[PDB]
């Protein structure tokens, strides 16, 4: 009966206008006031903490918090009017460290149920990773035993890539690497990110500034603000604390 009691103790365009949001709603909040704007087709990194606009974008990304204040809108429409569950499967995450399941490869690469295997290894010879799954053991139908850990950090990377690329992704959400990979690799992980972001809204979760120096724009937060936001040949010439950083 303690048993049974556990149990039972067992139950394209984007702007950013204004937006307060906080978790606790009593320590601080996560981002204040925060304002940009996104046209479609750019590539925008976003700078400050760590994770708390890494999260905090992230989060609102993923909508996993309403704000307290202002609005945050995805194509024009405020994301507290659109369907949750439509708006993150209708969003494709492209993380540097994916997790897979415990299945195929062609499964492990269906988080779109519908998809045909000729369009998921297509797509994948579109995201240039057609050459790495067909030189795994089975192809398509390789067993992805361990969740995936035969695989490369950077073959997982680009797994992830043709992962958003079959869900045919509106914008993008990229976790920048923490770590190395080669240079003709991280070189084409680079490119590969420019063809995705090319035609489409990307949004880098930047933490180092040095990579950062070709992105199309960059966004430095400070204590919860968003206080500017430029390229960074010009964010350098500021020689503010993105300059600092870079």
């Given at each position: 009966?303690?048993?049974?009691?556990?149990?039972?103790?067992?139950?394209?365009?984007?702007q950013?206008?204004?937006?307060?949001?906080?978790?606790?709603?009593?320590?601080?909040?996560?981002?204040?006031?925060?304002?940009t704007?996104?046209?479609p087709?750019?590539?925008i990194?976003?700078?400050?903490?760590?994770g708390?606009g890494?999260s905090?974008?992230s989060?609102?990304?993923?909508?996993?918090v309403?704000?307290?204040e202002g609005?945050?809108?995805i194509?024009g429409i405020?994301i507290?009017?659109?369907?949750?569950?439509?708006?993150?499967?209708?969003?494709s995450?492209?993380l540097?460290?994916?997790?897979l399941?415990?299945?195929?490869?062609?499964?492990?690469?269906d988080?779109?149920?519908?998809?045909?295997?000729?369009?998921?290894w297509?797509?994948?010879?579109?995201?240039?990773?057609?050459?790495?799954?067909k030189?795994?053991?089975?192809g398509?139908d390789?067993i992805?035993?361990?969740?995936?850990?035969?695989?490369?950090?950077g073959?997982?990377?680009l797994?992830?890539?043709?992962?958003?690329?079959?869900?045919?992704?509106?914008?993008?959400?990229?976790?920048e690497?923490?770590?190395?990979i080669?240079?003709?690799?991280?070189?084409?992980?680079?490119?590969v990110?420019?063809?995705?972001?090319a035609?489409?809204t990307?949004v880098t979760?930047?933490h180092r500034?040095?990579?950062i120096?070709?992105?199309?724009?960059?966004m430095?937060?400070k204590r919860?603000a968003?206080?500017?936001?430029?390229?960074?040949?010009?964010?350098?010439?500021?020689?503010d604390?993105?300059?600092?950083?870079?």
């Open positions: 009966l303690g048993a049974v009691k556990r149990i039972h103790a067992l139950l394209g365009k984007i950013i206008q204004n937006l307060s949001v906080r978790y606790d709603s009593s320590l601080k909040p996560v981002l204040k006031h925060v304002n704007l996104i046209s087709g750019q590539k990194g976003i700078c400050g903490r760590t708390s890494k905090s974008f989060l609102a990304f993923f909508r996993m309403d704000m307290f609005r945050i809108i194509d405020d507290a009017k659109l369907p949750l569950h439509t708006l993150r499967s209708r969003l995450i492209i540097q460290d994916p997790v399941f415990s299945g195929t490869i062609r499964f492990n690469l988080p779109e149920k519908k998809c045909s295997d000729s369009t998921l297509e797509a994948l010879e579109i995201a240039q990773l057609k050459l790495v799954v030189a795994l053991p089975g398509l390789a992805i035993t361990e969740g995936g850990e035969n695989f490369s950090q073959q997982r990377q797994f992830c890539l043709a992962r958003a690329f079959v869900r045919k992704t509106s914008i993008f959400i990229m976790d690497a923490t770590a190395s080669d240079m003709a690799t991280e070189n084409i992980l680079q490119k990110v420019m063809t995705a972001f035609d489409r990307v979760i930047a500034v040095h990579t120096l070709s992105a199309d724009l960059v430095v937060l919860g968003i206080l500017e936001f430029d390229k960074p040949e010009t964010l350098l010439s500021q020689k604390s993105v300059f600092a950083s870079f």
